[PDB]
Design a protein around this nucleic acid. Structure first.
Length: 167
RNA sequence: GUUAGCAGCCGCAUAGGCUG
């Protein structure tokens, strides 16, 4: 049994559902909601994540704290009432590694030249993921990327985005 | 199906993982 609370995207025609989902997830991340005890799941995920973001936790989920955390997005969301669920679908984030990323790390670790690395990776294409994803702007790394979500076994350990990590 | 699919770290790894 997990305590769950649901965030439904609402009245978002001007910006799009995926935009609101992206800002909700990033705001929860930036404000420290995902402290390792809170997971995230997406009940209406089919090919994108859907229009509902559900937080789940063993400890209490507080509607007041959640609303104040998202107080710059309340016009685009409806925060539901606390519930509880038996089996929650859990997710992890799959990362793609470009050829340039791999070549640069090879140069650092193997101490080889650029053309040596290009030859060693000459038949590498790059990960092309089609899973549902949420666009994320990382401040510390200065990058925008597509956070691909893959259904996983519930490890009961979660990262700063509410996604399962190995324990 | 979002105009996005990135930058890094760990690792022998173009296995896997993690950071944001």
């Amino acid at each position: 049994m997990y305590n769950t609370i649901s965030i439904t995207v609402v009245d978002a025609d001007d910006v799009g559902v995926n935009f609101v989902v992206s800002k909700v997830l990033s705001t929860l991340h930036n404000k420290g909601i995902f402290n390792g005890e809170v997971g995230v799941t997406f009940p209406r995920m089919d090919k994108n994540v859907g229009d509902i973001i559900t937080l789940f936790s063993k400890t209490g989920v507080d509607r007041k704290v959640l609303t104040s955390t998202l107080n710059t997005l309340t016009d685009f969301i409806h925060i539901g009432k606390p519930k509880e669920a038996d089996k929650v679908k859990t997710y992890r984030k799959v990362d793609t590694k470009s050829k340039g990323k791999l070549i640069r790390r090879c140069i650092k670790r193997k101490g080889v030249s650029a053309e040596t690395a290009e030859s060693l990776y000459g038949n590498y294409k790059g990960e092309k993921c089609k899973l549902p994803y949420i666009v994320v702007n990382s401040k510390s790394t200065g990058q925008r990327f597509s956070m691909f979500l893959e259904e996983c076994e519930n490890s009961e350990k979660f990262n700063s985005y509410g996604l399962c990590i190995v324990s």
